[PDB]
């Protein structure tokens, strides 16, 4: 993948770990039924004012070696290709071709 | 003096305990007529005890796990045959002929890649 797309992914991780407590504060406010509706309105306007890249749903799990946005696996952090290359070189423990 | 046999089927596993008696069938603390709402399964669980003449002769305590209606009935038949051969062993010459002592090894086939099922291939088109 590109270098700029990798840089965008790192930036969206840094912001998602930075503002993580504050966004949950505001969502606790908005989801709280026992709250002032003007407070819930102020919270949702604050949440607009926060950057869009602070959301974890904005960032996409790329391959950790190549940045490939598709074919990802959460357990390995890799695409389906580099999984196969590592499993064939025996860099992945306990992983072998199955048959049942 | 209960006599035991384990029967297995597709994915079922019966635990059959034979006692001499009057012919009382208890499956998971339930009657056979209560448990299998199916006369074919009521037949196949009574098939060896009428191959031999032991319908009235023995009572039975059965537990069974896993599977379906025919699966549990098959493992029950195979447990009964295993236990009657434990009881007498002179009956193996007939129950082999009846095809009962043979464990039916017809497992389900796995789904394969590309194929929508075990063997059904998707629909083909040249053009």
């Amino acid at each position: 993948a590109k270098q700029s797309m990798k840089a965008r992914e790192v930036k969206r991780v840094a912001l998602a770990d930075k503002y993580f407590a504050k966004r949950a504060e505001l969502k606790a406010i908005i989801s709280d039924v026992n709250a002032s509706d003007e407070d819930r309105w102020n919270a949702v306007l604050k949440l607009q004012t926060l950057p869009r890249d602070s959301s974890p749903s904005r960032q996409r799990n790329r391959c950790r070696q190549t940045g490939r946005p598709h074919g990802f696996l959460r357990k390995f952090g890799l695409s389906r290709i580099k999984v196969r290359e590592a499993a064939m070189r025996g860099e992945i423990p306990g992983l072998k071709k199955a048959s049942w | 003096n209960q006599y035991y046999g384990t029967g297995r089927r597709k994915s079922s596993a019966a635990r059959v305990f034979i006692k001499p008696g009057n012919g009382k069938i208890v499956i998971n603390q339930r009657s056979l007529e209560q448990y299998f709402g199916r006369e074919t399964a009521r037949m196949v669980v009574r098939q060896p005890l009428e191959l031999v003449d032991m319908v009235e002769k023995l009572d039975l305590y059965i537990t069974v796990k896993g599977g379906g209606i025919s699966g549990q009935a098959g493992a029950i038949r195979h447990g009964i045959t295993r236990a009657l051969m434990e009881y007498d062993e002179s009956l193996r010459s007939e129950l082999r002929k009846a095809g009962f002592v043979t464990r039916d090894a017809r497992q389900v086939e796995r789904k394969k890649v590309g194929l929508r099922k075990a063997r059904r291939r998707p629909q083909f088109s040249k053009r």
């Binding site: - | 199916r38 006369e39 074919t40 009521r42 037949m43 196949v44 095809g99």
Partner: protein, 151 residues
């Protein structure tokens, strides 16, 4: 197949009568693996068959089967510029399978409401030796004795 003729698998008999043939009939009637329903349909149609005839359900089934069993079928050969429908003696197994198949197809095609009503009516007509199933038996024998010159 090319290499071998095979050895066929064993079928259970029905629980009611012990007949292998009736279970072959419920398998031919059965769709989608629902054997329990097809067993119920056969036992209801043979219930009304013995009601309409006073005989055994098994006996009147064999009578209706008897009046539709073919003896000679045909097959296409086509070694020349056109199709030869060559006759051939039918083995008693295929006689019985074609009979139960034709009966089921006609009972699907009848306009009665219950399937057991289409099948008991078709069996009672076959025992009277009329109906579409025997008309299929007739059209088969007619193409047989027409192409009888080929042997």
């Amino acid at each position: 197949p090319r290499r071998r003729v095979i050895g066929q698998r064993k079928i259970l008999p029905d629980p009611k009568f012990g007949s292998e043939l009736l279970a072959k009939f419920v398998n031919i009637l059965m769709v989608d693996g629902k054997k329990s329903t097809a067993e119920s349909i056969v036992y209801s149609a043979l219930e009304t068959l013995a009601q309409r005839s006073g005989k055994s359900e098994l006996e009147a089934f064999e009578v209706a089967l008897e009046n539709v069993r073919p003896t000679v079928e045909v097959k296409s050969r086509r070694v020349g510029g056109s199709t030869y429908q060559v006759p051939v003696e039918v083995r008693p197994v295929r006689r019985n399978a074609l009979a139960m198949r034709w009966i089921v197809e006609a009972a699907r095609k009848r306009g009665d409401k219950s399937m057991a009503l289409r099948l008991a009516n078709e069996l009672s007509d076959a025992a009277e030796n009329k109906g579409t199933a025997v008309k299929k038996r007739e059209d088969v024998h007619r193409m047989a004795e027409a192409n009888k010159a080929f042997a």
